[PDB]
A paper describes a structure:
The genome packaging motor of tailed bacteriophages and herpesviruses is a powerful nanomachine built by several copies of a large (TerL) and a small (TerS) terminase subunit. In contrast, TerS is a DNA recognition subunit that binds packaging initiation sites (referred to as pac or cos) in preparation for genome packaging. TerS also stimulates the ATPase activity of TerL, while repressing the large terminase nuclease activity. Thus, three related small terminase subunits from Pseudomonas phages [name], NV1 and LUZ24 are polymorphic in solution but adopt a nonameric quaternary structure in the high affinity heparin-binding conformation.
Residue numbers in the entry:
A (entry chain G), G (entry chain C): 13 to 120
B (entry chain F): 14 to 121
C (entry chain E), F (entry chain I): 13 to 119
D (entry chain H): 16 to 118
E (entry chain D), I (entry chain B): 13 to 121
H (entry chain A): 15 to 121
Write the structure that this text describes.
Amino acid sequence: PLSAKEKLDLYCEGLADGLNKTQAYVAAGFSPNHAQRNVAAYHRKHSEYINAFISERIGSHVPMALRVIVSIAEDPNEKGGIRLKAAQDILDRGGFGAKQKVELTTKN
Amino acid sequence: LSAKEKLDLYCEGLADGLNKTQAYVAAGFSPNHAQRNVAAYHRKHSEYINAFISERIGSHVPMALRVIVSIAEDPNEKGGIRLKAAQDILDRGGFGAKQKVELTTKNV
Amino acid sequence: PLSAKEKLDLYCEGLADGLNKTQAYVAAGFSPNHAQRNVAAYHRKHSEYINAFISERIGSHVPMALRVIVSIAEDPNEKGGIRLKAAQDILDRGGFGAKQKVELTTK
Amino acid sequence: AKEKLDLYCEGLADGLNKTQAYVAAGFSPNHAQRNVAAYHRKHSEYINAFISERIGSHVPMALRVIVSIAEDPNEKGGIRLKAAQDILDRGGFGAKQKVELTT
Amino acid sequence: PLSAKEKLDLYCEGLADGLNKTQAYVAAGFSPNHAQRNVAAYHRKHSEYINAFISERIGSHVPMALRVIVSIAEDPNEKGGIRLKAAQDILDRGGFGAKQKVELTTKNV
Amino acid sequence: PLSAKEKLDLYCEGLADGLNKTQAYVAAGFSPNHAQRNVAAYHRKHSEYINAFISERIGSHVPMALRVIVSIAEDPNEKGGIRLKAAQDILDRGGFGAKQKVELTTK
Amino acid sequence: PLSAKEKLDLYCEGLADGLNKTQAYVAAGFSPNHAQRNVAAYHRKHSEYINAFISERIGSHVPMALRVIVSIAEDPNEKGGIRLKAAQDILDRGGFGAKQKVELTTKN
Amino acid sequence: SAKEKLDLYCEGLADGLNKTQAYVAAGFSPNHAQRNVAAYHRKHSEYINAFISERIGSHVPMALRVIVSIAEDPNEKGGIRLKAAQDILDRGGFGAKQKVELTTKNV
Amino acid sequence: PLSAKEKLDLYCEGLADGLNKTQAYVAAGFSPNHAQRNVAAYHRKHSEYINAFISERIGSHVPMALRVIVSIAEDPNEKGGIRLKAAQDILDRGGFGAKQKVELTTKNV
């Protein structure tokens, strides 16, 4: 007796690691005999929620990436080019770069 | 069941074994009329197969996410690879690029 | 009792595999002496269909490439950068990608 | 409640765990997997602003790294050139034209 | 007993294979002694047909290239990056590709 | 006896080199007793000026960069590719390099 | 006695091959006492024709390059990556290419 | 004198890259450094930018001569010579440009 | 009488080879004392012509580059990737190029 969206979230969490749709479906608590078509219909209904959830899991891992990038930028034992790319990366994300393009339209 | 279930079974065989005729004969079809029916059948049902294979491509995204997270968190990986994976998840998380200034000239 | 279209499709498959205009022409089951002008005329007549066929042939190979990329992503003994590129590719084709650019016109 | 949220935000930014950073902010320790989800999706924009400010905090370090690489005589030539070009690009001196012909 | 179109076709074939202006000119069957001034006018006259012929000839080679790319994709003993690039290539030409970009115009007038 | 603008400039310069916000705050000459809260409010207030200062410092380092790029271009015992990239770069900043695109829009 | 058009073409050919303005100028036959005073202006006169001449000369080498690319693509003793790049190149020049891009415009 | 110290301060920044250091090296008041250099630099930003843009224009013949020498040097690596030749041909006014567009809509 | 239009071009040649503004100014036969400012002002006056002249000098070097590229393409002992890049460059210069792009502007305005 659980929220249908919460059992859907359990299905999503089980799908994110163990990589099988019907397996996560029955692990979400559905009919084990009416299994392989009902998981397909359920997935085809709530596709947009699944995409938003996957983007949420991507966003959950960003602080690790930030620590990695800063540590590489301040690492004295790294190659010069990799430090330069890390410093460039955080400077770009900080709001500094530029591009000047000149256009010339010779129409016919 | 419905001929559509035999078609999706045929699509499953096409997704794994890379042969039109082999996936045809695995569906339970004519072994004598082999080159004839699979070509017309495939040329008719293109959109369902394309949607099915794009769904199969999407089926592997948790694996790819786990791989990228592992490369970012693997302590013994090269500096450049850790930096590039971290840049990738930061970009997919919603932290990105920057400015461009335009200058428009026109034909005499 | 064979269709012109079917003969044409056999000629296209033979051109994709046996790599010669006159050779694939006669392998389609045609006249071997009235060939060198006739195969050229036949090719320039049905060019759009041959190109559509070749795109169908390219699409015939996408599951192999899909398996290749998934295998490269799942290989524990592969170089790090290549695994990363394979996973990036699967994430991009799955529908999660790149972002913004700001415009400012000085005219 | 926002100051306790900032406490939780720093704990999340450094220790990389939702439930642990939740209880490390001085919040309810028993019921974790449900309330942290609602709180996290609730203040998403605040967390994003928090992380973008933290990204901006490291900019002086990056600038110093790039100038050091540009001034190092024992650095490879290609890396020195890329760094000097990079600060020149960020300083406001750059590129040029592209001509179009539309039929 | 040949027309201007068939001698032009022989001229184009000789130019595609034997690579010489006077050589491809005379293999079409003209006078070899007073050649160097007239070939410039001839080529500048039928340039577009030669270009279309050359693109046709390029289109003649696609199955060889396709076979090479597929073999590289299925070759297990090839470097990982080249196998990856090849699989990416056939997927891109097959119709599975890229994605979004957001615009932000801070306008002037 | 110096402006809030001069105290802000010293705080920003200290922020350029001196990492601690609170360290750059007290080195700018403010109250050391309540610094860690007041530096947060002060920084969140004057964000645009600090960003402008950092862009000013980036421009402050450009003559060094020009000297390095021209010197690497003039180095007689340097690799060809690096000399080529530097010469290309200064030629591009001088106002050279062209690129043509023909468009065909099928709406 | 020489036709002016043929003489200009000969001067152009000398620039194309023997790499000198004054060399091709004296190779046309011109006033011996003065050349530099006029040759610079003369070159500035027929600039567009010389550009057409060099654009024709680049096209003169196209079948050789095509043979080069086909041989590199079909040579079995070449690196895998170079074989792939050559095959890709001839496939692109044959007319088979790239795909989509999504736009999202936020206003001001 | 004042102009001499103005451009010498910039060349000193080009040589050892520090504003207070180049200010005290330029030959003005050595006693007050951190405030007077800030005011002086903020005033003449356009002047230093124009000066360095002129200095860049001073070096373009060097870049051209270096590139031509790299292109015609017979014992240089092949790829570097090819990149140099491509660059000089591109700046001479010769490049490829094809592109077919197809703009759709959600209706 | 050397005209100001042609003497400027001689100064331009001196700037392209002998690499100094004031030195080329006095090497045109000017006052060596009227020095550091006068060459700067002269340069600021005729900037567009100086740029056009250096562009003619840059255009002067294209035949050598073409010779080099064809030589690299024709070298039997050159690396495969480098010969391929040379052939790609000359094919692009001949008029054979790029390919498709699909646009889709689905947004909430």
